[PDB]
Ligand binder design. Sequence first.
Ligand code: ADP
Ligand code: ADP
Ligand code: ADP
Ligand code: MG
Ligand code: MG
Ligand code: MG
Ligand code: MG
Ligand code: MG
Lengths: 98, 523, 155, 87, 532, 528
Amino acid sequence: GMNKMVINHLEKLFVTNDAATILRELEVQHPAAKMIVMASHMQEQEVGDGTNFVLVFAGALLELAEELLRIGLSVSEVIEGYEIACRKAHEILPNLVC
Amino acid sequence: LVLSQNTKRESGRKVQSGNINAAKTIADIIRTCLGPKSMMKMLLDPMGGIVMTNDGNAILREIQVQHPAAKSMIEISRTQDEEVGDGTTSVIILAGEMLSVAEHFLEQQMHPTVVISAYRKALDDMISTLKKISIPVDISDSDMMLNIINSSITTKAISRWSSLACNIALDAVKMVQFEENGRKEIDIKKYARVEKIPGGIIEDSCVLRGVMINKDVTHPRMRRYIKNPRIVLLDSSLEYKKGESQTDIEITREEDFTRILQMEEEYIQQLCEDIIQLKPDVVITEKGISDLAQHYLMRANITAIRRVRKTDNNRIARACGARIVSRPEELREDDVGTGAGLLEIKKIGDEYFTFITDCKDPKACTILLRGASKEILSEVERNLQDAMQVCRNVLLDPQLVPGGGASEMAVAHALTEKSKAMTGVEQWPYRAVAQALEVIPRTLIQNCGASTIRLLTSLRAKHTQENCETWGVNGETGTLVDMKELGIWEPLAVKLQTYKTAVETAVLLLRIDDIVSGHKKKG
Amino acid sequence: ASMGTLAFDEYGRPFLIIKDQDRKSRLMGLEALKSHIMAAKAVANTMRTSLGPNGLDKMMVDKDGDVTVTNDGATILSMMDVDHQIAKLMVELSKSQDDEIGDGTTGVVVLAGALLEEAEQLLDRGIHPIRIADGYEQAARVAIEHLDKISDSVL
Amino acid sequence: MICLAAEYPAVKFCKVKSSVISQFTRNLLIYKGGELIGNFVRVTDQFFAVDLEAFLQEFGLLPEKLVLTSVRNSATCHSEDSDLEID
Amino acid sequence: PLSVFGDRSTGETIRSQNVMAAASIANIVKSSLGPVGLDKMLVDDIGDVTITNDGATILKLLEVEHPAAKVLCELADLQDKEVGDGTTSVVIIAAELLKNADELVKQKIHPTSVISGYRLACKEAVRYINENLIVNTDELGRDCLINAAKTSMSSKIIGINGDFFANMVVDAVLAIKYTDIRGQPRYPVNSVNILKAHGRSQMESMLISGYALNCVVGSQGMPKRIVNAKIACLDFSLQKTKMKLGVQVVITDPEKLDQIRQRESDITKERIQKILATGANVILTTGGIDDMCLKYFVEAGAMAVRRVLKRDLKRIAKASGATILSTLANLEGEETFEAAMLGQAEEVVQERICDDELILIKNTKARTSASIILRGANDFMCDEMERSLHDALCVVKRVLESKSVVPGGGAVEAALSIYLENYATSMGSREQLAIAEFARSLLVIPNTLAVNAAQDSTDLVAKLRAFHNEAQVNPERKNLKWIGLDLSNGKPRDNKQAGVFEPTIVKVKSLKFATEAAITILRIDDLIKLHP
Amino acid sequence: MMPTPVILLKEGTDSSQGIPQLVSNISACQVIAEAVRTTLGPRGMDKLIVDGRGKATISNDGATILKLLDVVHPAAKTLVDIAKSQDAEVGDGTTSVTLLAAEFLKQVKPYVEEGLHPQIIIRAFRTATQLAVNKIKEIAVTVKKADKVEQRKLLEKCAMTALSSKLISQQKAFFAKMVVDAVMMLDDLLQLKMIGIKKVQGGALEDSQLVAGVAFKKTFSYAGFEMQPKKYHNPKIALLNVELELKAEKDNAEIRVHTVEDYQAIVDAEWNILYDKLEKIHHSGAKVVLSKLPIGDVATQYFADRDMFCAGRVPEEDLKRTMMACGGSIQTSVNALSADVLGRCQVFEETQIGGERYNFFTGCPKAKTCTFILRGGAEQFMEETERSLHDAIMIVRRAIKNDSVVAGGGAIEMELSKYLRDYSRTIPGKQQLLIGAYAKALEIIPRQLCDNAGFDATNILNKLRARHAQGGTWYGVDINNEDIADNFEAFVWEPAMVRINALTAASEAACLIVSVDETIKNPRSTVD
Ligand SMILES: Nc1ncnc2c1ncn2[C@@H]1O[C@H](COP(=O)(O)OP(=O)(O)O)[C@@H](O)[C@H]1O
Ligand SMILES: Nc1ncnc2c1ncn2[C@@H]1O[C@H](COP(=O)(O)OP(=O)(O)O)[C@@H](O)[C@H]1O
Ligand SMILES: Nc1ncnc2c1ncn2[C@@H]1O[C@H](COP(=O)(O)OP(=O)(O)O)[C@@H](O)[C@H]1O
Ligand SMILES: [Mg+2]
Ligand SMILES: [Mg+2]
Ligand SMILES: [Mg+2]
Ligand SMILES: [Mg+2]
Ligand SMILES: [Mg+2]
């Protein structure tokens, strides 16, 4: 990954490749992006790493949700399938411990 | 400061994403205006007029945009409308779908040229499959032509009066058909004029065996009803006029002034006598007719009409079998138009209209439209234009292709089956643009109001069978129907043009990765 | 020759290096030396007329309208409302001469002006300015030794 | 004037704000060759397009009024070398 | 002190500014080079859209204020004028040459030495190209023309359809072939009328064996098809006669006015009667025709087309054997029209093309002409097809006139870089560095080709340079001179075998023009910009 | 792009991404280096920078020039940061760091333009820097003899090399001897605050002196001060932190009396408190009294009556320096003024230096401090003299820490370039180009020296390359002879840590600049 030079409203200079820091310094305005940022910050507070994973996975999930909604599915059905798959993934994850 | 201060330039993935999104927005504007269950839209012109239609071309024409990709899509709509006259909404939707499909791969590390090559291969295979699944048409069977026109007009507001509109369009097209010097033509634009008079009822609309103009006799004493007129058409005025060279006179004798005026009158009389020599009954001119000329014609019992437009005069010549002559002294017997079976100047509403409506074997016609208002009549005229364009497309090319998304699914399945033997990097865009054709059944189902996913899956499973190329979606009941039973068929030429135009629009918009703006015309 | 450099990019995007670089001037190379020598020459030529018994006074008026008729070079330069940086350097030189010795506050300015005037035509012939400074230092050492040699003592 | 622009391509219909150049706004500048020719403002006092067309044509201001080709033909205008036949 | 009313920038400041302007102009078009290049969309303030890939068009449409950038813009325009191909490559090469020359100058290398080195390097590169890197097209046959056209149309809106468009271009060029004095076969491209019309796909574009006019018959009464046409080309208007400014009609006897007015049109009547009595069928005139003459032609059952372009009329007359007649006057002082002035064509029709009509003069005799009708999705696409088609026609003309072609895909650039790097060591001291930098700068083209394809530019160019160095060092491995880039797979490939050629004139002219432009901008060391 | 009815970031946010952003960063670094190029070498020139207030700063120091610039480019500020870092860690090389970093970036710009992955360039820089630092540590010359005269000579040579680029280069031997003498008297921590630097206008550069003691300006004398003697031949110094004047006993103290006798007693008590403090000071035997707090006029007159010297409001730094030089101790209470808390100096004297009165405490035999009294004809003259002396002092201190020296004039960097090129000629080839670019970039300093001197850079570069290749380590640029010479034998010496830190900082800055692919600037808040 490549570091990013981010200048906040106070002209302070941040150069980093930490996703949480980039989101914090960026002045996000869209409420949905704000919600994703809050999820990323919750991940940072709870664990301390994996924020960029949170952003990437959320973006991929929402893109594929848009695809599913366009191909004729309903929002509730997509949500139910996502929850079922998340439960299945949480079930599978302990079996992958090396 | 190398370039101008107002010059704006951007490049990269941002330009591609913006172009694809603009095309998608253009598609989404008119997505809900496809199929027999389409809903009309009201367009407010900058001039104050109201356009009320569901035809794609008019809606896209009455919209001003800034993004150049949107302008390209508007031009594609105009090209599809001008070339074949039908399938205008379908091509925009198809282009948007292919552009979204291409963006899918563009987000990955695939170069646009690979996508373009796959698109062109898919277009060639699409053309081949469409030609393969076509069926012939016997144009001598009026029933088949009427059914084709009906299937063309079921999606418009004129579908309420379907048989009347189909008969009008078919009769007008067959009547305007002409052949000369071994060259066939239809030429709906010039002849076969559609004239709309608000009021009355649409059921009273009809196609005339001749023409009709908004003109009245120049002098009341002339006959307003002639049984079997002989019609003479002219370009030149029937009035004394100046010459090109400066021709100042010089009068010294007393009687020269009176003599000059007498020669003016005598010239008018000579012109009128040359006209009368052919013994006509109606005289039509594209320019003025002098009052003395009116008197001299009236002494010979001749009806004279003046200030007729050149296009209307040509239409009259085609209808009554005459020839426009600009020099009355060079008027031959062949120039006199015999073949007009009736001429009648009658009153409709508060305006006088001239009818020549009993012609034997006319090569021009006027479609008299009567309706609730000007907007309704404009929509009816657009629908009739679509019907006549479809009729002439069938007459020129007698092939036929199943409609209602059956052809889309059949071609998609054929291309998908062909894609199993590629084993290349470009097979993915090939398959993904093959499946992009499923948008037409998808939007048909969506407009019908039924479940998209279940019906689309059922249709795909049906098309996986061997003899199911004609299985499509019923656009008004949301059920799978064999289109050889429903009867919805549409010309092969329209399908070919739509697919070519959509694929080439996608190709054109996929070759752009930089936008520069703000520079002046500089010539 | 001023207002920095006008490129604004190599590609088209904005290119800002220094705050308010559009309102900042800059002088480069020999032109800066020429301007400095010209300013110092002007100051020295102004101050040289007040040298010696036949020198003429300068009438200085401050911002309040007060009048100060004087011959003291250090006072004249102190009350002068210069803006050029080299002129301020000349004023500081005169004040330093006043502080350390108290006399000859005009001779220093005239001598510096003449030195820079000669250095101007030396630079026009392609000599590096540091070489000129080194030669001036060597000659100053020689002159100081000669002054010590020819000095005389008083009771 | 948008409609008239289609009829008369040679004209250069344009707009301008009053601020970019108080009585100016509350209470049609024709230029030909760089000098003012027509000097009519508040033309609403003296509506649809052909009315304005007649209003301007009555004073010999609007130029006198063509077939719509496929799209266009022009390619270039330079030393063509002509279509020399032989020798 | 100087008191000049303006801005004066001198030395390294102005040198860097000039190099910055050249580099910006280069970067404007660097992304439109090679088959993996992409088109650009240009929007005016009016809102017009011009999708294009041609470098000359892009640089002509842009608004440029820096003179050092205007120099490269007119350089591209000149390269387009005298060659027609390689307008982007010449700009890129010139900008890179200027960049490396400035880099050398900043190391206290005098600009005169750099200019001398650049001149020597350019001369030696041209000599090496002419002596080692040219393939005679005599033994290749017709395949060389097709391959050259396909290579020219790569990186264009018609690149994929090259298999068909190259055949169209070659046939069109060979149709207009003629030989002048000295037995030189000259190919007058730009005599092929390019007609654009949206509608069917690209593959429905038609090559007309004859000529195509973007004009229709004057009157609807005339027939729209003549089988055995007798074309009459005229250069005067057929209207009512009007006496000249020096002649004025003054009538003293009223009995003569009617005769005057009668003759006023009877003169034109007699002229048309002669024209039609000689046996003519199709009449084309640059001037206008009024309704009376149109009715004369309608009655005669002939064709009459007005407002025909002068160049189109000249092409039709030369193709069909007709002679332009600005007037009907013989050396006997009479008013006559001979049948020897009539051109003949096997057919003249009026076809409908997407709700519009154009006149097709088909299969003219005494000479063969050609025209191309381009069908596209919209106007912008047709414009791009026309530009690419003109580029292909120019390339084919260059290949046919001078029968030498060079391998494409950066093979020439890599070979020249290696050869000049070797040769620089044998000439001068500082100009040796100048020639070395010229050789290095020549490598920008393969680098840009690799970069635009998102391939490993450094490794690929290193492999190409290794191949060419082995070819030059080893006499027996001399067959590797044709090794060029294959951006489809991102690996070196023998481009001569693959069929990637281009005229030698393109490379030679681009090199000379880039060297001259670089020298011109390098000679500047001071700028005075007076305030208007 | 599209209107996007709800925008993602704040309106006015600027974003740049891709190769153009990185090459723009490299160009900005080039501009920053150009802003300071001509201040390098014995022929370097000073720069005059004027701030908004109109004050002029004249300097030959790269760090000072870069700080005075209002650099706002995010990439360019890294050069200023590394220059300040070099100034903090070493004190010299503030121009070399910026030149080397910008030259690294310029060398790798062509490879950046052709789509090379920045991580490869970063790895190449890391490897080259590690190898260069190892080579410097290997070939640096050290003498393990602990000889006083040899160590003194090494210190003097290092100081002369550090000073031979400033306006005091003509008297560089004099100032280097002064600096070396000043540094060795520091005890163990080499604290910079123990070397006072006084600037007095008027006088020649050679008139500046190093006081083996402490000197400070006279501090606002009161009435009766001129009656005190101004020279003592063995004075005892009473360093104090005490306010010696009539004042309220405490801020919140209040006196409540109901008798005139108690009123008179209170007045006499205040007078007796002051006189008791003064008498306790006087009976200690001290003759010079220095206090951080003000000394009142009554105390001044009392001391004058006893023929004693007083000086109130002395700065805290000057009191600490006086205590370190003399050996006493600063006292806040005068109750126990034993002989162990009183400083002693051989001679105290108040003299005039160019229109200012200064107090001199000379003759201290165990003094751990010094005081430079810099004479000059202008304020900026003295400021630049102080900056040059600071550079020399930092070099001498670092040399005290470790006496490892290398030859200057680009000789060390020519040797490093030769070694790096030889190493790069033996690797597979992708890293070969980058390490060769690093080695070629290591040639900027001798080229800049030649350019500033006005020579022909290319000829000197070729001669240095030929001599280093054919054997020879310390061959650099000879400015006076317009040729090359063995700079080690020419006593152009530098501490090895200077070049080590310069290379480390330049490489880190280059890697940081290269590692960035996108710059985002949020709109400014509270613009007003
Ligand atoms: N009754 C129907 N049931 C299902 N599909 C239909 C029916 N009538 C028309 N269609 C389909 O709708 C499409 C025409 O949609 P329309 O709104 O006319 O778009 P356009 O105006 O662009 O032609 C045709 O492809 C045809 O196959
Ligand atoms: N099929 C191909 N394979 C490799 N290189 C090619 C191919 N076709 C063209 N090229 C090269 O791409 C380069 C760029 O050509 P282009 O930029 O399109 O022409 P112009 O410079 O006239 O715009 C040419 O030098 C040519 O040698
Ligand atoms: N006598 C000398 N001869 C040649 N070069 C010298 C001499 N003295 C110093 N240098 C060079 O000058 C450079 C230092 O210049 P200076 O501006 O004083 O400090 P900085 O290292 O901060 O640039 C060193 O690289 C050194 O090689
Ligand atoms: Mg992590
Ligand atoms: Mg339809
Ligand atoms: Mg005196
Ligand atoms: Mg080309
Ligand atoms: Mg130094």
